[PDB]
Design an enzyme around this catalytic site. Structure first.
Site, PDB file in Angstrom:
ATOM      1  N   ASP A 113     -10.835   4.599  -1.079  1.00  0.00           N
ATOM      2  CA  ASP A 113     -11.364   3.712  -0.070  1.00  0.00           C
ATOM      3  C   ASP A 113     -12.908   3.794   0.008  1.00  0.00           C
ATOM      4  O   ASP A 113     -13.532   4.905  -0.059  1.00  0.00           O
ATOM      5  CB  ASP A 113     -10.834   4.112   1.309  1.00  0.00           C
ATOM      6  CG  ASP A 113      -9.406   3.799   1.524  1.00  0.00           C
ATOM      7  OD1 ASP A 113      -8.767   3.242   0.640  1.00  0.00           O
ATOM      8  OD2 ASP A 113      -8.909   4.090   2.635  1.00  0.00           O
ATOM      9  N   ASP A 130       0.828  -1.191   0.000  1.00  0.00           N
ATOM     10  CA  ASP A 130       0.000   0.000   0.000  1.00  0.00           C
ATOM     11  C   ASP A 130       0.859   1.237   0.000  1.00  0.00           C
ATOM     12  O   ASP A 130       2.088   1.154   0.234  1.00  0.00           O
ATOM     13  CB  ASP A 130      -0.973  -0.088   1.186  1.00  0.00           C
ATOM     14  CG  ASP A 130      -2.196   0.838   1.056  1.00  0.00           C
ATOM     15  OD1 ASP A 130      -2.349   1.629   0.092  1.00  0.00           O
ATOM     16  OD2 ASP A 130      -3.001   0.828   2.006  1.00  0.00           O
TER      17      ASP A 130
END
Ligand SMILES: [Mg+2]
Length: 533
Positions: A395, A335
């Site tokens: 997200d 990430d």
């Protein structure tokens, strides 16, 4: 160029036409060819010297364009190119919005490709240069940014295609097919299912809560069990746990003993100002005027970027991922990868994209061919060929996000939009990860019809299906949604009206496990209509 639009185009500053060409400039030399291909033209070749910010194409800007952010979390969306006002860039997150933020704060920027009704302009790779488009004074200009690096010998240009057909989705799909061939894309034949801790527990995950879910997961159709951000003592110190967590090796052996493929989150190109790794190795990071250059601010700390031109750094990455592999981890969510590509000073005079690519290549080697790599917060084009799955939206969240603007803050509605607008990368670049399904019935504001809308769209699109819930809060409805979702997988999707501006999309998928399917979704009304067989 029988087309009037086409006669008006410029390639490396010259009137567009088919042929082979040489531009000998003061500081650089480019040799290129413009060749007819199926649906349009390809511009390829090689460059040496100091190309800097290299102008490849110029044409009049269309009024409405589908623009794409370089990374997972940024928007892919239709914008009015004439009424555009630049955004203010947050100084803590500068480089997620753009690797060339002098462009972004001034002019409309699209990275890698840009599209209008009936026409795709798209670069096939980003191995050395960062390829992007800007609307400068009503003109669409394609650039290859080489970040002031100098090349003694010729290196290959990133190829550019210009494709034309009235079926814009077909064009995007063909573009993505060409990208996948140019980069030997990894499209696994099997897509993992699983559980991820993040969207219920966030940073407050405990091992005790993990263990409860691990037991419950035996009743759900999950191959992978993935621990997210929470377990680690600091960013960079991936093998030192905190709180009630056991050792990273121990977690893997508990997870595996319960019959799951262990997975784990890292931010592998990131080291915080407080981390052990940064404090032991201060000359491991990208610099600005000789000192550590803040890459971004998060976890209430300055975060630095590993300098992936350094062998010491790549050895450390290799050892880290080799250790995780030894422990039993076979799924890796890697990430904040944009960090590895930040502009600045590195030990070798290579581009940030060259550096970025040496880091992810190292991680791939270390984890091996039998591990699944899920990219996130990542530059998209440079990662094709390396990752197996890629987060392609901002997200999601346990809420729809009514008062959340399209600015990258978490919201189901904006995560889902990007899974739509980037659908064409799926099964071409990698497996698309639309972000996690959230199917719990308590500790959320999502309605049953919002959970369905999100989940069934993800299924029709054949995207990866990972659930993120306290599984004790998932009841009959959630289990039903998951089961029905999994029945929509396996097809070849198409978003038929990709240039829509009203958030209503018609999506078909041929040859799913439920036959030919179609879903019409409206992200504004929060409604869907699904037909099967
Ligand atoms: Mg598939």
């Amino acid at each position: 160029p029988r087309g009037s639009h086409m006669a008006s185009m410029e390639i490396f500053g010259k009137t567009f036409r088919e042929g082979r060409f040489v531009l000998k400039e003061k500081n650089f030399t480019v040799e290129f060819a413009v060749e007819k291909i199926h649906l349009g033209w390809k511009i390829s070749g090689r460059v040496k010297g100091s190309p800097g910010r290299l102008e490849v194409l110029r044409t009049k800007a269309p009024e409405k364009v589908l623009v794409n952010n370089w990374q997972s979390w940024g928007p892919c969306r239709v914008v009015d190119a004439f009424s555009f006002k630049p955004p203010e860039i947050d100084p803590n997150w500068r480089y997620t919005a753009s690797v060339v933020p002098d462009v972004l704060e001034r002019n409309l920027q699209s990275d890698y490709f840009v599209a209008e009704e009936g026409k795709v302009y798209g670069f096939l790779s980003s191995k050395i240069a960062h390829p992007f488009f800007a609307v400068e004074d009503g003109e669409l200009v394609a650039y290859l940014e080489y970040f002031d690096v100098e090349f003694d010998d010729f290196v290959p240009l990133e190829p550019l295609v210009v494709l034309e057909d009235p079926n814009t989705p077909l064009l995007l799909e063909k573009y993505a097919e060409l990208v996948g061939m140019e980069n030997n894309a990894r499209v696994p034949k099997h897509t993992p299912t699983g559980w991820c801790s993040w969207y219920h527990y966030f940073l407050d995950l405990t091992w005790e809560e993990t263990l409860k879910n691990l037991k419950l997961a035996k009743n759900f159709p999950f191959e992978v069990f993935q621990i997210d951000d929470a377990y680690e003592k600091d960013i960079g110190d991936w093998l030192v746990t905190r709180g009630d967590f056991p050792s990273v090796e121990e977690m893997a052996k508990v997870i595996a003993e319960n019959g799951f493929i262990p997975g784990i989150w890292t931010a592998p190109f990131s080291v915080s100002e407080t981390s052990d790794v940064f404090n032991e190795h201060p000359d491991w990071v990208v610099k600005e005027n000789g000192e550590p250059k803040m890459a971004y601010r998060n976890w209430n700390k300055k975060i630095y970027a590993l300098d992936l031109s350094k062998d010491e750094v790549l050895n450390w990455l290799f050892d880290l991922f080799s250790s995780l592999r030894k422990m039993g981890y076979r799924y890796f969510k890697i990430d904040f990868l944009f960090a590895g590509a930040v502009p600045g000073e590195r030990k070798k005079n290579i581009t940030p994209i060259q550096a970025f690519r040496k880091g992810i290549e190292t991680i791939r080697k270390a984890v091996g061919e039998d591990s699944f790599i899920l990219g996130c917060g990542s530059p998209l084009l440079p990662a094709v060929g390396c990752v197996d799955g890629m987060r392609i939206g901002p997200d999601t969240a346990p809420f729809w996000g009514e008062h959340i603007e399209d600015n990258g803050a978490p919201a189901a509605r904006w995560a889902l939009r990007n899974a739509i607008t980037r659908y064409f990368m799926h099964d071409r670049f990698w497996l698309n990860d639309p972000d996690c399904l959230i199917l719990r019935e308590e500790k959320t504001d999502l309605t049953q019809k919002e959970k369905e809308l999100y989940s069934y769209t993800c299924g029709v699109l054949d995207n990866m299906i990972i659930e993120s819930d306290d599984l004790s809060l998932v009841r009959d409805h959630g289990k039903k949604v998951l089961k029905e979702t999994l029945e929509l997988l396996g097809g070849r999707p198409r978003v038929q009206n990709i240039m829509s501006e009203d958030l209503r999309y018609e999506i078909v998928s041929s040859g799913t496990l439920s036959g030919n399917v179609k879903i019409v979704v409206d992200l504004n009304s929060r409604e869907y209509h699904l037909e099967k067989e």
